[PDB]
Design an enzyme around this catalytic site. Structure first.
Site, mmCIF file in Angstrom:
data_model
loop_
_atom_site.group_PDB
_atom_site.id
_atom_site.type_symbol
_atom_site.label_atom_id
_atom_site.label_comp_id
_atom_site.label_asym_id
_atom_site.label_seq_id
_atom_site.Cartn_x
_atom_site.Cartn_y
_atom_site.Cartn_z
ATOM 1 N N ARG C 117 33.382 31.383 35.192
ATOM 2 C CA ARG C 117 32.108 30.688 35.235
ATOM 3 C C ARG C 117 31.268 30.992 34.007
ATOM 4 O O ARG C 117 31.292 32.101 33.489
ATOM 5 C CB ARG C 117 31.392 31.168 36.490
ATOM 6 C CG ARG C 117 30.178 30.432 36.865
ATOM 7 C CD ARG C 117 29.720 30.795 38.217
ATOM 8 N NE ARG C 117 28.294 30.592 38.372
ATOM 9 C CZ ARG C 117 27.567 31.129 39.354
ATOM 10 N NH1 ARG C 117 28.122 31.905 40.286
ATOM 11 N NH2 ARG C 117 26.271 30.897 39.415
ATOM 12 N N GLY C 121 30.071 34.581 31.860
ATOM 13 C CA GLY C 121 30.407 34.760 30.469
ATOM 14 C C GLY C 121 29.186 35.122 29.658
ATOM 15 O O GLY C 121 29.259 35.904 28.724
ATOM 16 N N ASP C 135 51.327 26.502 35.554
ATOM 17 C CA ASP C 135 52.432 25.554 35.485
ATOM 18 C C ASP C 135 52.327 24.505 36.549
ATOM 19 O O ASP C 135 51.931 24.794 37.679
ATOM 20 C CB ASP C 135 53.757 26.261 35.784
ATOM 21 C CG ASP C 135 54.182 27.239 34.690
ATOM 22 O OD1 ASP C 135 53.574 27.250 33.579
ATOM 23 O OD2 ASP C 135 55.156 27.993 34.872
ATOM 24 N N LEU C 144 42.745 37.034 39.350
ATOM 25 C CA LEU C 144 41.640 37.248 38.435
ATOM 26 C C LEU C 144 41.785 38.564 37.733
ATOM 27 O O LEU C 144 42.068 39.577 38.356
ATOM 28 C CB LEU C 144 40.329 37.248 39.204
ATOM 29 C CG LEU C 144 40.164 35.983 40.035
ATOM 30 C CD1 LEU C 144 38.910 36.100 40.877
ATOM 31 C CD2 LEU C 144 40.128 34.754 39.166
ATOM 32 N N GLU C 145 41.575 38.535 36.430
ATOM 33 C CA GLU C 145 41.616 39.706 35.605
ATOM 34 C C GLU C 145 40.217 39.973 35.118
ATOM 35 O O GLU C 145 39.795 39.437 34.132
ATOM 36 C CB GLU C 145 42.578 39.486 34.451
ATOM 37 C CG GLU C 145 43.959 39.089 34.934
ATOM 38 C CD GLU C 145 44.563 37.906 34.227
ATOM 39 O OE1 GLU C 145 44.049 37.428 33.178
ATOM 40 O OE2 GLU C 145 45.632 37.489 34.715
#
Lengths: 175, 175, 175
Positions: C117, C121, C135, C144-145
């Site tokens: 989002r 950021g 893919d 999520l990292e």
């Protein structure tokens, strides 16, 4: 589908995409180069708690700024040493928010994506954290999220900082 | 519009997109996997001042490298401890630049985007800082901007490091 | 070509793209907003050596978590100070892995891209390291990292964390 140089020029010529100020030579094969505004803000509180109003300090550079990686641990002595040696106006550490000079408006059938310049990426300077897609119908200058990840980096007022890639939507959005 | 496996193979078969060396099994549903070259460079000066020529040190791995987060604060003792325990050739800290083994040429109607492999992202290892679009008409190997954000990560010579996604341009660019 | 709101709704209406749970108001002009699951994992070993099985600790938040930049150097005292002052359940430092609440399935003619989002950021909180294309044919929740790059950030269970952008493939992939 990504707009080429010839498409960017058309969309800008007919006011479909607004870029102010606009410069023809900033058009590349399939992107448009954007420049570094002179204004930055630095967060001033201990944590980011988004249920509160945030406190910032604002700086306005005249020529250049030194952006240091987080936990460089700048003292006044170090900041003064850097100011004199590299002739920079300010020395910051960690996240700094800036902005493009360019104001943009996107129509209902275009999404754009901001990415930082690749020569800055090669010295580990980012001007964006997220992948940075921007909604169809967006209006504004673009906020830059500047972080250095290796060593301090000097940036210059009005340099090319990054670039916009424009992509067609399948259908128009309700803006 | 993003090229599928069957499109990547066609463009490569007719020399529209050059990938050297090319390996069929590296083609996924809609990307092409690229591999880690054995050469890296590490920046050697105090700050990145892009109005000067930059000084680097070059390393050539034989098997593997340990990439440490910035401010791990490696001493010779720590580097030696890591070399012996994990059998790595080098131990680096902060930004390291590498390259793909693969050399690419893109035609005037394709832009590609490099992204690091998602299993490496899940251990907080990035091989790119910017979103990484690459211009139509580009020629070269791809520069990797490798940074670890959580704990040190071992990388292997020639491993899959990331992947290229290819997207059609709306119109041809003037390359 | 990127799907607009009206396309996202159609693909979801006919089960071409699966999003469970699905909420209409999370559809934006040309993306779909996703939410923060309550489960996170934190890596527990000294280095990431991907030829070994990895050891993690799992946490399940009830309301919120404080995510600290790497090398904040949290002691028990500091963690307790943060827990009481900001009323968070956990305090972590460095990379933390989470997940969306949303489970997705993509068909053979769509690739999606996760991006964090943009308001997060702007406080230097990332939920993805790689550009994050997914893919055609993918099935699962999205990993999520999460890394904070400036100061600690509070995140809330089930908040909007990011968004999916869906793009047409040129041709179907062999999934």
């Amino acid at each position: 589908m990504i707009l080429s140089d010839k498409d960017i020029i058309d969309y800008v010529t007919s006011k479909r995409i607004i870029i102010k100020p606009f410069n023809k030579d900033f058009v590349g094969p399939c992107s448009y180069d954007v420049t570094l505004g002179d204004e930055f803000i630095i967060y001033d509180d201990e944590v980011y708690d988004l249920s509160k109003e945030l406190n910032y300090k604002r700086i306005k550079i005249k020529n250049s700024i030194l952006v240091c990686p987080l936990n460089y641990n700048l003292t006044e002595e170090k900041i003064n040493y850097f100011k004199e040696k590299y002739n920079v106006d300010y020395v910051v550490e960690g996240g700094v928010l800036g902005t493009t000079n360019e104001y943009i408006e996107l129509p209902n059938d275009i999404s754009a994506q901001y990415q930082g310049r690749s020569s800055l990426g090669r010295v580990f300077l980012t001007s964006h954290q997220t992948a940075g897609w921007i909604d169809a119908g967006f209006k504004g200058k673009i906020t830059l999220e500047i972080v250095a990840f290796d060593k301090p980096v000097i940036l210059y007022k009005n340099q090319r900082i990054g670039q916009l890639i424009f992509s067609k939507l399948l259908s128009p959005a309700d803006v």
